[PDB]
Design a protein around this ligand. Structure first.
Ligand SMILES: NC(=O)C1=CN([C@@H]2O[C@H](COP(=O)(O)OP(=O)(O)OC[C@H]3O[C@@H](n4cnc5c(N)ncnc54)[C@H](OP(=O)(O)O)[C@@H]3O)[C@@H](O)[C@H]2O)C=CC1
Ligand SMILES: NC(=O)C1=CN([C@@H]2O[C@H](COP(=O)(O)OP(=O)(O)OC[C@H]3O[C@@H](n4cnc5c(N)ncnc54)[C@H](OP(=O)(O)O)[C@@H]3O)[C@@H](O)[C@H]2O)C=CC1
Lengths: 1190, 48
């Protein structure tokens, strides 16, 4: 975006040229600068900005493509006053804080906010913590300097979000005093001192003086935001059976197929084929007639759920990951046989996308060129190649040796099992894999397919018994590493070509001293030897050997690494013996898999799976409507509410159940995104919903009440001060009462309190149909005034006429047009109207002002003109006119003593009968989006209310609890509980702490060996303490068990322990040869030992704990080079977390690819990281991962 | 100087104008001030 200071600079240069002076010779003054729009500089091309000056009026105007962009007033400064640039009195006389933000931290904070400034705009050398005074650079560029001024001004604002300048009351520039003020540091760099005075709304530095700067929140909505890949790190046995048993549709399909088979109906292709086969004849069915039939000639059998059920199940992903893992290289070569019918080419490439560094060379082969001729576009979109090899014959040299083979024999027909397997194993490289999908004979579905397809013997041959397949594998000297089996007899074979037998090394890796590193370091050094090196740990289930091998394999010589781990999550589970003579070790050796993990009577390895896309939901009593995507009504959905944790004792609390909640224009503007949430007065969390202003429901005591709330009133419960509650009259209905509060309260405040309306006066009430208009009309007629009202349409006119008989046909006008001015002036004899209640647009507003009579009073309740700061000719005040700015939002913040006046007025109106409920259209809670759309259309008359809960016949109900309801899950914390973040003063720790506080923690303990030693840390800590949070700094190591106990105890003082997070990390990078046992001890001490100490102490004395999060890294699992110790520590942490959950205790381990704001994966922005952390916290899996693919 | 006076106002403030120069000249007045609850009064004893 083009900086506003850029506009100022170009205007200044234009004025200097017009006067003939040079820029540095011309002290200029700006006034009433206004930025109507922001210009976006394109990457390629140029944008022309045109500046026109009106010398007579001292006005300028910048335009682009004939569109106004900037306007204001500019003129030469006749008599510069050096007194002007003297630094103002400091708002805080004595900060007395040696700490101060440096350049890096300043722009780190600004990046967190959303500002991304490059080197040329990084002009702030330092800034005081409060952000009031600092030092700026002077690179001889004016635009950079003034933009740095604006940056300094923005740095102090507590409000979050992205704010940009919109108006500047006045700017003074004096190059001479600027040159005088500049002074040099020790370096040759030139600097100037800046001072910001929020009290006087003035920013002064060098020879510049900005006053009255006004910044307006930007939407801050960027398209094409990063989309992280979410996965769950789950254990996976090598062999499984009944994989798809959970699915019902598959079972129903099986029932249908067997039913047709019985005695020799659905949309699925296979049941349709069976029905066709049985249709022609009940007995003696022709093989030809059943083989061919319309709606079956297509290769839609694979599309049948039964046949391709396993492929859709994760088993395919597990097998593919297993194949990829045991690759000496980082590149994979895969070939598909009979691809025309297999169609795996359309599926396999998609599954391997998550791997960041993997490079794939896929090639599809078929018996005949015409087969697979179709879908050539599908092949083209992927990196695949055509093929002609027919498996029966020996493989062509072109394919040669490939890492992996995929067959999909279940649908494709194989000429002969033995011959095809021989050809394949010939094609398969040494140590490669053969993925084979087939249907097992002797199973119900197997027998059913055997009865069918008898016409083609080749397919019949493909169907074989499980033991037959196993025997076939042995004959071709192929070893079955793993097997996946469906519940209906389908299966998925994964076989590996044996590698030349070699004597394997054995190295215990369970020593706590890490001295085994030297032993391993020596062995790997002997790169000449090709003997595989088998690391095996059996002493501890928490050994993180998995991460170690994952990292080591990348480093040179890592090809020889192979792991064997025994981790049982149940003590009762026995431990197999891994002695060389023991059978199990020999079996795993024959398999020759990199990862061999045994857990509770099963051999397997950890795998990555994409987790469910759906957002978790739970049944809750407290939930509030929210828009998950700002500006989209389609996203409106219910979310869990923080009200679950609340104190009923407090008299100010007065928690109330919600039955009907109304919608107002403000709610639509918020949902539509036309109104920024920050525009709502008050201190609001960044993540929250500000929908709904009024409601009506039963109090905690059951008494029916209607209430008014600043926001969050559209929910199943509201926390409200009793001052904002009225008792519903016995004759009203809770639905009716849902409309009275806001409209009547604002009408009374506008007329009686401010306008001081007297009986017999004259009024002009715009938008009579609207709720506020109806309330105002009802109030006025009671006094006995004469009313003029404007209505958009004829039906609204008729409705108002019916509702208010006293009102007359001459009391109407047209609102959408500006013709009412003539009508009012004519029917009033030209005198005008005493009182005006205006809520219309700029031109309508100007028209209304002319309607005022002498001693008139203008009541303004709109916002558009006020926000835009449109001018108002003051000549109207020559009469005794009084202009009122009426905002009801002020009461919710202060002046409650004043608010009681309006409360009494509304109560008196209610009891006297003046107050009448408006017409209501009811939408059920589940249809809230429909209500929003209907009100957005603008055809509604009266109010739109959402029936959150139906009213009971009883007048007063003892238990007013809301009915349980299902909504999206969110994370909130009780106020009384205490939370601990180990190493919370790091880059991630502080951001996580802030995120938690926004969830209402109120009691925090941050651990760090060094303690507060940076300006940013001190700034954040003091900011939090100002909000009332009880922050604490420990400096107690979690590595030492005594240290962990002390940390927990001191945390308990603030209150019961709620959650503990382990973000402590010390890293010592370097290749294995460089690593030494000391570095491993140092790296694992805060992460491995600390986690064990925290687990022990928490399980000992933290009964109320519910959150136990341990931050791991993607390097573990995925693998990375030169970070073996890091991977080991992370893997150990993950193992501890996995064990904890098995016992019912809470525990979580998160793997982050990279953090940007504070291995082929781009750094992830902090906002996305926190969102994903919330989602993870709400999920039940033991370990989760997140990263952004390059 | 009139513009300077407007800025000094606080929320719920009231502005009482008794000078008749700017009013007669019909000089502009930014309406953004009214966002803060504010009542701009045009005082003229002459009416009585
Ligand atoms: N103290 C304060 O600052 C407060 C201010 N207010 C203001 O009161 C005003 C009136 O609110 P209220 O009458 O309850 O609003 P409603 O939406 O209930 O009524 C809107 C009225 O104005 C017109 N209108 C407004 N918005 C739309 C729209 N999106 N689509 C179609 N027609 C629309 C309608 O047509 P038509 O007019 O043509 O018949 C209708 O008469 C608002 O401007 C609000 O900001 C309210 C309370 C507090
Ligand atoms: N890209 C990333 O940053 C990624 C982060 N992670 C993990 O996420 C977490 C957050 O990392 P992040 O905060 O960015 O990194 P930091 O390096 O900033 O975290 C280390 C912090 O912990 C403190 N600390 C060190 N030892 C201890 C100890 N024994 N007890 C208490 N505090 C201690 C350090 O202070 P001091 O040195 O003075 O003790 C420092 O403040 C870490 O667990 C990290 O491993 C993993 C994946 C990606």
């Amino acid at each position: 975006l083009f900086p506003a200071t850029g506009y100022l600079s170009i205007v200044w240069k234009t004025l200097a040229r017009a006067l003939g002076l040079g820029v540095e010779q011309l002290p200029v003054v700006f006034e009433d600068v206004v930025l109507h729009q922001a210009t976006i500089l394109p990457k390629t091309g140029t944008v022309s900005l045109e500046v026109r000056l009106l010398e007579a009026s001292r006005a300028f105007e910048v335009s682009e493509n004939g569109n106004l962009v900037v306007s204001g007033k500019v003129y030469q400064w006749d008599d510069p006053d050096p007194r002007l640039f003297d630094h103002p009195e400091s708002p805080t006389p004595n900060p007395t804080e040696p700490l101060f933000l440096a350049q890096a931290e300043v722009y780190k904070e600004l990046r967190l906010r959303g500002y991304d400034y490059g080197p040329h705009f990084q002009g702030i050398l330092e800034a005081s913590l409060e952000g009031d005074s600092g030092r700026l650079l002077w690179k001889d560029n004016w635009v950079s300097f003034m933009d740095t001024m604006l940056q300094m001004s923005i740095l102090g604002s507590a409000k979050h979000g992205l704010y940009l300048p919109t108006r500047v009351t006045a700017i003074h520039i004096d190059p001479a005093t600027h040159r005088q003020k500049l002074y040099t540091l020790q370096d040759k760099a030139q600097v100037a001192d800046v001072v910001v005075s929020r009290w006087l709304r003035v920013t002064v530095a060098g020879g510049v003086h900005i006053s009255g700067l006004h910044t307006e929140s930007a939407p801050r909505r960027q398209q094409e935001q990063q989309v992280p890949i979410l996965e769950k790190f789950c254990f996976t046995p090598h062999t499984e059976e009944g994989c798809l048993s959970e699915r019902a549709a598959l079972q129903e399909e099986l029932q249908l197929c067997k039913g047709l088979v019985q005695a020799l109906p659905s949309q699925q292709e296979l049941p349709r084929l069976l029905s066709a086969a049985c249709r022609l004849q009940l007995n003696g069915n022709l093989q030809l007639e059943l083989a061919q039939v319309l709606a079956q000639e297509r290769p839609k059998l694979p599309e049948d759920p039964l046949l391709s059920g396993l492929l859709d199940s994760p088993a395919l992903k597990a097998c593919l990951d297993t194949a990829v893992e045991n690759m000496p290289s980082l590149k994979m070569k895969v070939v598909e046989v009979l691809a025309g019918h297999g169609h795996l080419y359309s599926r396999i490439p998609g599954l391997l996308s998550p791997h960041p560094l993997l490079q794939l060379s896929y090639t599809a082969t078929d018996r005949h060129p015409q087969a697979l001729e179709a879908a050539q576009a599908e092949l083209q979109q992927h990196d695949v190649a055509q093929g002609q090899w027919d498996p029966a014959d020996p493989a062509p040299s072109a394919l040669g040796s490939a890492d992996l083979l995929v067959c999909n024999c279940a649908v494709a027909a194989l000429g002969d099992p033995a011959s095809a397997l021989s050809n394949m194993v010939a094609a398969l490289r040494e140590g490669g894999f053969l993925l084979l999908h087939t249907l097992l004979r002797g199973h119900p579905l197997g027998d059913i397919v055997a009865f069918l397809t008898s016409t083609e013997p080749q397919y019949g041959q493909g169907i074989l018994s499980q033991d037959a397949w196993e025997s076939l594998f042995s004959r071709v000297s192929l070893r079955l590493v793993g097997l996946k089996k469906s519940f209906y007899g389908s299966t998925l074979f994964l076989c590996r070509r044996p590698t030349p037998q070699d004597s394997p090394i054995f190295l215990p890796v369970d020593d706590t001293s890490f001295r085994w590193v030297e032993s391993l370091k020596g062995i790997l050094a002997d790169e000449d030897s090709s003997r595989p090196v088998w690391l095996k740990a059996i002493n501890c289930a928490t050994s993180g050997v998995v991460g170690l091998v994952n990292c080591l394999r990348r480093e040179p010589g890592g090809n020889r690494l192979r792991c064997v781990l025994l981790s049982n999550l149940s003590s009762t589970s026995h431990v197999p013996e891994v002695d060389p003579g023991s059978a199990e070790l020999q079996k795993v050796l024959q398999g020759d898999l990199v990862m061999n993990v045994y857990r509770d009577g099963a051999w397997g390895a950890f795998r990555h799976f994409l987790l469910e896309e759906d957002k978790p939901e739970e049944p809750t009593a407290h939930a509030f409507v929210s828009t998950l995507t700002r500006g989209d009504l389609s996203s409106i959905r219910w979310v869990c509410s923080s009200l679950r944790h609340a104190q009923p004792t407090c008299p100010g609390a007065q928690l109330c159940t919600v039955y009907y909640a109304s919608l107002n224009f403000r709610d639509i503007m918020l949902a539509t995104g036309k109104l920024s949430p920050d525009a709502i007065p008050g201190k609001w969390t960044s993540q929250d919903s500000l929908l709904g202003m009024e409601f009506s429901g039963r109090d905690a005591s059951g008494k029916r009440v209607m209430g008014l709330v600043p926001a969050k009133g559209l929910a199943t419960s509201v926390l409200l001060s009793p001052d904002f509650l009225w008792d519903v009259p016995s004759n009203w209905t809770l639905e009716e009462a849902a409309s009275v509060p806001v409209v009547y309260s604002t009408a009374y405040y506008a007329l009686v309190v401010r306008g001081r309306v007297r009986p017999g006066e004259t009024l002009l009430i715009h938008s009579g149909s609207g709720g506020v208009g109806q309330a105002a009309i009802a109030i006025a007629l009671s006094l006995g005034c004469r009313v003029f009202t404007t209505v958009g349409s004829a039906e609204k006119r008729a409705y108002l006429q019916a509702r208010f008989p006293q009102l007359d046909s001459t009391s109407f006008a047209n609102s959408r047009d500006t013709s009412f001015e003539q009508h009012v002036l004519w029917h009033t004899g030209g005198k005008g109207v005493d009182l005006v209640l205006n809520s219309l647009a700029e031109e309508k507003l100007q028209a209304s002002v002319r309607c005022l009579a002498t001693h008139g009073r203008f009541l303004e309740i709109g916002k558009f003109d006020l926000s835009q700061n449109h001018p108002l000719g003051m000549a109207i005040f020559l009469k005794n006119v009084t202009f009122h700015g009426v905002l009801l939002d002020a009461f919710f913040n202060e002046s409650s003593a004043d608010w009681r006046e309006v409360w009494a007025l509304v109560q008196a109106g209610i009891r006297d009968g003046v107050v009448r409920p408006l017409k209501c259209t009811v939408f059920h809670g589940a249809q809230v989006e429909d209500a929003f759309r209907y009100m957005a259309q603008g055809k509604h008359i009266g109010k739109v209310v959402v029936q959150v809960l139906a009213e009971e016949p009883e007048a007063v109900l003892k238990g007013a609890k809301p009915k349980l309801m299902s909504a999206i899950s969110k994370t909130f914390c009780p106020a009384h509980k205490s939370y601990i973040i180990a190493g919370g003063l790091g880059g991630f720790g502080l951001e996580l702490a802030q995120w938690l506080i926004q969830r209402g923690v109120q009691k925090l303990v941050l651990t760090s060996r060094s303690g507060i030693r940076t300006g940013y840390q001190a700034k954040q800590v003091r900011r939090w303490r100002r909000q009332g949070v009880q922050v604490q700094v420990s400096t107690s190591n979690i590595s030492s068990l005594e240290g962990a106990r002390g940390l927990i105890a001191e945390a308990a003082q603030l209150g019961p322990v709620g959650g503990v997070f382990n973000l402590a990390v010390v890293l010592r990078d370097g290749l294995l040869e460089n690593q030494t046992p000391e570095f491993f001890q140092d790296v694992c001490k805060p992460k491995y030992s600390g986690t064990l100490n925290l687990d022990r102490v928490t399980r000992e004395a933290c009964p109320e704990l519910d959150y136990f999060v341990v931050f791991s890294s993607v390097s573990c699992g995925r693998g990375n080079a030169g970070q073996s110790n890091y991977g080991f520590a992370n893997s150990a942490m993950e193992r501890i977390c996995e064990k904890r959950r098995h016992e019912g205790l809470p525990g979580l381990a998160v793997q982050w690819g990279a953090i940007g704001d504070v291995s082929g994966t781009l750094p992830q922005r902090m906002a996305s990281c926190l969102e994903v952390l919330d989602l993870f916290l709400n999920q039940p899996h033991m370990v989760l991962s997140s990263f952004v693919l390059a």
